[model samples]
Target: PPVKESSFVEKMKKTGRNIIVFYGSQTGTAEEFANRLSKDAHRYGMRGMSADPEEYDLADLSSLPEIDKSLVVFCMATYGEGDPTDNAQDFYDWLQETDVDLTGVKFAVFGLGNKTYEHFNAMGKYVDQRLEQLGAQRIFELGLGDDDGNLEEDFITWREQFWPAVCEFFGVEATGSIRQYELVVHEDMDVAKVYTGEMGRLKSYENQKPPFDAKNPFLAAVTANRKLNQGTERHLMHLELDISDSKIRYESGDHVAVYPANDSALVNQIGEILGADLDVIMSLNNLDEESNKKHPFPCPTTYRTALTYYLDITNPPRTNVLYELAQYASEPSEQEHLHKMASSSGEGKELYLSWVVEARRHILAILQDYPSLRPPIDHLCELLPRLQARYYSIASSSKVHPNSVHICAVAVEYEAKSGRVNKGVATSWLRAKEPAGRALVPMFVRKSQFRLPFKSTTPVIMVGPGTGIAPFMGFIQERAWLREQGKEVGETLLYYGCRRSDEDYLYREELARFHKDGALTQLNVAFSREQAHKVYVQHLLKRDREHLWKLIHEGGAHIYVCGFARNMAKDVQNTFYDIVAEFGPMEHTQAVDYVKKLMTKGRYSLDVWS
Candidate 1:
């Protein structure tokens, strides 16, 4: 078994290529980042392609030669917890079992994660350490991009250094300036290039339900759009969407990914700044054969359509963005301010945070406010990330609403500052009521690991506050369905919390019915702002510590926690410790170990978001 020279470098040498990048992405962030990096790869005298980890044969990594002379990059994003993304799980696991040494494989890893989570960059750190343990050498230092902070800024800063370092390694001349695309105005559009959702979609739009999947999402019609909270600024909407003909099979604890278009208002604002016709049709072509990026969206679309359908025009401006715009600044003060804001250190960082991040100003707002910087349309197109699909937990059981998917969401609208409202792009778009077959919402099922225990009669405990109850609603419904099928179902206890019962209580009537029907064994409600002190779900858990202990120790209950993964979840975990220390008659340290054991057994599961 003398090795074949199958390292990435060998292929690159033979095929006259330069780099290969692998991305682990749930949303499109990492994918887009990999592509963004690839665009520069060409300018550095290299050709490259990006791949989703799932699509590649990870086991082939065992075939890599002892040393790789070329470069390979990994753009990985950690999932909600410490779990690998669905696509990267196979690749992630394969590394642990890798038989060959990667000592010579010159690789770089850039991790994307949220700092708010306990295991930030968990996947990235795990992979980096495992690779090093397996003798892989890092070409560039590992980059950790925090989602809660300026991830793009982190990515750009790393990439800037990465390009120069990589060029020197390969002995290729590196150029700082490379235009990815040439935007040309076209009189006639290429109908073939225009995307009508025809990438890996249904073979034919004739059946209308050819195959509902991720790329080709079913146009689910909105059936019911009832607002739950009427009196307060807070609005909880229960949406019943019709997926009757889509053939999209989903069970309890699944998620629906909604593809959204940017607001027309935002498009208008960007158009105003450009001082150009938003309706002008444009075609983008790669400046060179080795260019990494194509049109971010489908070609031959109007500027408005491109910006509104594909680009993240409203996200916070990154340091790179300010730097890019700085070149076009007409005034010295604006140029200096942008440079200062983009700076990694000093008072400028504070100034940027205070004016931009703290002010809650988005890219569009920044562009509107900073009139001195007028970037080319093509640069804007290349700089912005794609508008990704929004995932919401499926709130109804397949047994109950087989043809319909229920979603519980609050319309996200708040006053960020004067003349600028911070509104959720997807949620605000979904708020309007449309009848079945009228509301054309592009949606597909995103399978989740969060599930009810396989065995029935295994007790269930769910701690879900606000929309966190979304998946639990399906859990309850599925249990009721199991009961109807003469199957043994668990005793489900739900500890739910909200600000008030009147304005924000979601699925109130449905939960009551579930309790009466024996599906929901116990329901605990904590109205946070209804009383003098905020009565949260954490408090309710302590109140029922004895009952909870019975469920865990005797009944073998599976626990589920959802919603924000911050103080609430931390408080609830501590309460579990308190319960164990008092009820199990164990020391505090023992209680912690006991909870750890529960997690190992898959008795404790959490589906939380930052």
Candidate 2:
């Protein structure tokens, strides 16, 4: 299973190489960060290589503990619900049980997490702890980067300080010059070979032509697109895509990453602001084969295609992005104005966040608001973040419907101003696309740790509000199928809430059927607009505190809470604390500890987003 003959450490012994950066990346951020770290080791007479955790073995390090002084750099991002990423699970499992001698394996760790979530940077901290337990030495304290605050500036601060210690540990002087790949543009680029319409045809899966994944996505046909919302101008779409032709399989709690492009109108508007030459062909070049690839998106396509598909033209530009783009301004005052607001911290950041990022202002508005500034295509490409897929929780159980995949999504259409509309790219695209159209987009299923308990009879308590009720639908369908097979299922409790009975009440009929089928033991709903005073899921949690306490204590119910983590999730957790304190013999401190313990033991889990 060796990818190569110990080329990292073994070859490093002969060729002045020792630094190895391994990343457990849920997304590409940590992986790219590892590559950034790799360059700092140049003057230390060390060669650096970025590796995926799934592709390497620590057992190799154990084999050469005496001779291999390879300084390992771990850049692990905390995944959903305080767990390792899908790609890192195997590596995590191996590290847990491997009797490796990491005595001389000096290391450093950096964690990427969102402070908005409960288990912030737990995976990176875990790696740091377990490695110490395995006798590895630490060179520096683990650097924690929180996405909620400043995921970049924190990294920048740590890297500036950490590089000196890293240099000292390797017994090398700092040359200070960055020895990395310089971008090379080729005029003879072939636009014909570039990936455009579909992220199609990757690996051969089960002898199929293309295996579907993040890079190469399956263009699954949409069979159904029904409006789930009743009698309201607010739209909710029930999308069903056919996966029968491909080997793309999904379970109950997993999510589908939907790839969408900015509509042509929005794309053209942004292009006009930048004064874009739509037909220009560009691609990234890295001379070093061993080094990590750093192109924002797959390239060589026209600038128009990149604008429509690759670049996040809609997401508000961050301070860093604004500052970077400021360098290309044509007017001095415009440049000054941009630099004033481009500060990532202090009052400048607050202004940009409030006036720009908070109000859903895209970069196009910035360009129009100040017509004196003109940024080139290269800078525009560099300034923008890559358009990322919006993960929608799957609403259908794979076991029940093997050929079809379902999702319940609301098409978000809000007006930033009277004329200018701020619409969700993915949701809007889903709404506009023909139900049985041949126009296909990229898509892939993302596996998650959120799942039912292994035992069939483990009681479950699900709290899902609004669109968050997606996975619970699958949970019910799965349990119902199990019942048909005469498998004794556990008691299912659902706490679902929405605006009202008449508006935006998604999947009501199906949920009612599930209740009669005994897939759902209880269904408690809260309608925010039905009463004079708005009632939410957390309010109901307080009322049903005694029932929840008994379920957790006596029946040992597994807890799943899905919603926006901004307030709802925190509110729900506080409700649990209220329940624990009131129902238990434990003190207030003890009750808080109890809830934390539940989270640590994986009895309580949440799938949430900002």
Candidate 3:
């Protein structure tokens, strides 16, 4: 294993690639962008390849300056509020250490972030600034791609400007570009060698093994599926998964990430678009001999399995995919239209936004929209992003349900602007499972920072709406179990919200049982749609301002907020400020500082999602 190449500089020299694009990606967006940049360098007569910083021996970065005209490009994405991606942690930490020298090393940075988050592009910003501070020469200003607005558009604009700067610095001219991958259609491959939706190691799902993680997940059996709400317009499903045999351990406030497959109907549609036999075993090989990745995905896999398990066909296609499609379109008008959409011009941006991005058009729809475009299946697979796992808050406490894991989710369904129905891959998949069916789900547990206080006597306050109530359920269950064991549990107050008590009030009976057990000190519910005035969680918080103030100020209660981040979390924070201001008899500014102090002291926490 030590013999395998680790030094990036050595690999680059051996491969004859001057430019190396490194990505710190969590969900593969930054990786895709990095790969696209690597390919784009080909057009500038510079050979390049994308790399994972975690994979390389980055100490060899000192050797980069020795290369004739080498360039280092970082596509760093900020996770959560302001954290480096999991893969980037080692490199990110190393850059912060003292005595690092990168003199004469020319580099560029591109940050992928959402403007809606408080610490926008924090990872990218730090990496860019740190590199320059360590004596690395800046080739260009840091490019911040905002996912909140148009991440693709931002990238396209920045890249359009970056190419010329790169060409000038490296003294290179544009040349003919080569295809990144080559498709090989296997006539008769061993049936045992084929991948049939197994992720990570081959035959993992079938043979099963210990030390299961993100790469190799445990196939947990679904023991029960209960509809928590009677609402017709909306849905809330409670799932219980049996992880007894998996040797997977979890705490009350951890997360479970489920890998879901695409719907058969959608997969079949893509097969029809390609006019392909679903059973055909195919593989896409990386044309570059230097690449660590030999195949685009696990291979000798049937096209149907690729569509169902590996490829992401639902999300809107990236501009690079459109650019690739432009070359394959037979109709001149269609070809020109696709080319324009993928360009950095104003018209291209507008059309891409309106037709593809805003309309939420997926790859299948794109193929249908342009009848003349028939990119090969392997090529298309190369262009597509990998299907990602959906993470859910674990709703069952380990103390109460040690052998199993539970999750509460709302079935995501809506009509897109393109007049096509859209559904969540995980939610829809979970909804289809039944208690008697014993459906096996590919899943793994993820540790979280969100947790309860160590002391049972510490008071707690929680606010959760809709499926956000998942983790709070675990908290309450744990508190109840502790109370039953003759432990003195402190005051626990819950603020829960929904549209209606009759329609969508989740865990109604469970709340009553917890209250009776003396685990719950108080229960507050806000039914927003029951009355015309539309009362939310914040409104309820405002009404119980004095109680909340007493719990936080006197009892030193830990307050937790879990739900949608867009409105609820912010509104809840503002409401707390108002409460602190009125109750403490202090100014708003002082109240704001007081809240920030609570967060710093770990008295206030959030487990929110976009």
Candidate 4:
């Protein structure tokens, strides 16, 4: 079928590669960083290759020292609760058990994590420590890239220092050159064979099959769509997706990944700017024959499909992509200006931050701004990154609606520094699908640890404000279903807040009905704008501190906080510490550790995002 080589060292030998950058990625960011690092090795007069850790057997890792001037780099990203990525599970386990000596191996590590989480960069730190324990020589200090901050700038800053260390270690001189994929335009290819937008092995959406996943998703039908809020500039949607025909199954507290298509207007603008045929078929291949990947995205596709469904053109272009674009500029001054912005120098970095990142200029905006710069459409497609799928929390219990999955999301829209309105790619696409409209969404279920306790009699304290009430809705529905089946359900408390009851109180009638039916034991409402002082869920939590403490200490309630990660989640957790200390007759430090114990015991759970 394909190349059968399983050993990394053997592959390196056959491919004439010395530097190997292995990536453990979940959402593709870590992989992107790995590829960038591999390319950077070229500047030091060395050949390099990026790899997925799961693809090859790493049992022969100790043999890597045999290669001349060899280096091994890990671009690792920490996932949920200090867990390795799904693809990195095997590699992580192997590293934990292997006692093989790596005396001559030179290694470097860069970790990607969000500081808001408790186990920030845990995976990265573990790999860096383990490599040293295995007797490998450390060429550079471990670089921790915080996703909460500017991860790109963090990587850039780390690489600027890292290269010098590498050069010194190898005793090699520095040289640089730009690299890009080879583009081929096809005209006589059969129209039926060319990919339109299908991401799987299927050539068309109509030919999609079962066993859907991140690569091949089920095209689920939209059964229902409704608005949940009023008197707000933003629109909050409640969507019910049908998965009755597919073999897909999901639980109450899971996530759905939706692949979104770009706006047609934006796609048209790019084609118009390039003065190219939107329907012409093309493919982009790696110049290096050893690279297993033939195309960045599904190939033999039209330019229109690539722009709309494959590449991410809305975000600010990466510096390396811009560097390649500079080579195609017609005017000398324009070329110089572009090269300066793409450089790592002080002025270049400053201009890039101010003009490209802060201004929120997409590729189309850049093309429009620089009229003289015209890059080939195929090259542009190759340089752009893939459009990532957006994930949303499921809001309907499978027990209540066995064939349907529900989601509650608010459309994201904001004004950029350029004064142009920026709409979220996924949310905007979702908002367009009305209940009456017939559209199949490419979606898949992602299992999560944020699940309900096994025993129905266990109490649960849920603090979810604004749209954070999503997963809790499913929790309530499933518990109610269990009660109807003659099982004893325990006390369920929900603390919800919004701007006002009349304006933006989500699921008002449904919650009131649930309370009347005894599905909800107690409901606390905090209408922030109703009074002089803005009262939030955290304030409501403090107001009922005594009852909460009793429920947690006496009733063994599981605590769940879901919302924005920055302040609300942190503030709510701190409030718990105060409640525990004041009621348990324990000190503040003891309360903190006790809360940590709860988390370890699977009593405290969180589902939040930046």
- At residue 219, candidate 2 shows an lDDT of 72
- Compared with the true structure, what per-residue lDDT tens digits does model 2 show for residues 195-302? 564443312211234467876677767878889988677898888888887788899889988789888987777777777776667755455654445565565566
For candidate 3, lDDT tens digit of each residue in 1-610?
A: 2232577888888888888999999989899889889988778878788898887767677789877888999999999659899989888888877576889899999999988788999999999998888888999889999998888888888988898999987788777525767878898888888899988888898999998888899999999899999778788899999998788989878999999989999989888878878888888777776677987778879888988888888888888788777888999988988888877767877888899988998988888888999887767777788889999999989999999999999999899987799888889989998777469999999999788889999999999987789999999999998888999899998999999988999999999889887788888888999988989888989999998899899988999999865688989999999999999989999999999899989999888878
Candidates in order have lDDT scores of 0.78, 0.77, 0.88, 0.87
Quick one: how many clashes does candidate 2 have? 0
Q: Specify the poorest-scoring 10-residue window by lDDT in model 1.
A: 197-206
User: For all the candidates, what are their Cα RMSDs to the real structure?
Assistant: 4.1, 4.9, 1.6, 1.9
* Tens-digit per-residue lDDT, 1-610, candidate 4: 2243478898889888899999999988899899999988777899899998888776677889889989999999999889899888888998999998989989999999879788999999999999999999889999899988777778888888998998987899797545457778897988787888888774646777777888788888888888998767668888998887778888878998899999999999899989988888888777887788878988888889999998898998877777778988898877877787755568788878888888998998888778888987877887899999999889989889879889899888899886688888998888888656467788999998888889999998999999999999999898888999999998999998889988888899999999999999988888989999989999989999998898899998999888754688888989999998999879999999999899999999988866
Better of 2 and 3 by TM-score: 3
Q: Give a tens-digit lDDT track for model 1, residues 331-380.
A: 88887888778665578877677777777788778776777877777677
Off by over 4 Å in 3: 1-5
- TM per prediction: 0.88, 0.80, 0.97, 0.96
Q: List the pairs of residues colliding in candidate 1.
A: 67-104, 68-104
Say which candidate scores most in lDDT.
3
Task: In candidate 4, list every pair of residues with a backbone clash.
Answer: none
- For residue 416, model 2's alpha carbon misses the true position, in angstroms, by 5.7
What are the clashing pairs of model 3?
A: none
